[PDB]
Amino acid sequence: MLLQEMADEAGLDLDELSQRLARLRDQ
Amino acid sequence: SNMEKHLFNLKFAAKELSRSAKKCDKEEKAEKAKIEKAIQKGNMEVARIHAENAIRQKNQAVNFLRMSARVDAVAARVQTAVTMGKVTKSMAGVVKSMDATLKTMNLEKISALMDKFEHQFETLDVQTQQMEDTMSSTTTLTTPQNQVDMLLQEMADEAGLDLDELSQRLARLRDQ
Numbered sequence A: 001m002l003l004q005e006m007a008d009e010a011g012l013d014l015d016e017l018s019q020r021l022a023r024l025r026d027q
Numbered sequence B: 001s002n003m004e005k006h007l008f009n010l011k012f013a014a015k016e017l018s019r020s021a022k023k024c025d026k027e028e029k030a031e032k033a034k035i036e037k038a039i040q041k042g043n044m045e046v047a048r049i050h051a052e053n054a055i056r057q058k059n060q061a062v063n064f065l066r067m068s069a070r071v072d073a074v075a076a077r078v079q080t081a082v083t084m085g086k087v088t089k090s091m092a093g094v095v096k097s098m099d100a101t102l103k104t105m106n107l108e109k110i111s112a113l114m115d116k117f118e119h120q121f122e123t124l125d126v127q128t129q130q131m132e133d134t135m136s137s138t139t140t141l142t143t144p145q146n147q148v149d150m151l152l153q154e155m156a157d158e159a160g161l162d163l164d165e166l167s168q169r170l171a172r173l174r175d176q
Helices: A002-010 A016-026 B002-039 B044-104 B107-138 B145-159 B165-175
Strands: none
Touching: B002 B044
């Protein structure tokens, strides 16, 4: 987040995941 | 830089050749006068040497003038080059500056910032309206509506241009 913010400033472009993995584990 | 001083030297040599041609011209005049004042005394050789000297002065003068014109043209060309080079350097500088600025202050950042400006001042309008409502509610006894209306009507009739029972009836309705 810090890098993205400071890139937007300097002007140049560059949890649910684990939950879904848990879903798969339960499956 | 070096080109500038070299240009200065070129123009110096140009005007030097010019003044040298003028010097040769005035020397030609002087020799022509000396031959006049010498031929009167019956000197043929002295006149001859004076004459050839004058012709040499004239020829060298025209040559110096031609050379001066050439060098002036060359120096003018070099001046053009120097000025164009300064312009090019300045344009490169502003190009670098604009590149840095645009990379820093891009179009997207501009748009976002301007939208933020707009929304901020809309919020400020809301604030002003809130304060308007409150200030109009507070200072209401000292600024009735009927009084100001009567004043406006009277002063309009003067300047010449056209523009309790209610609550009692509402009370009647409330009682009904």
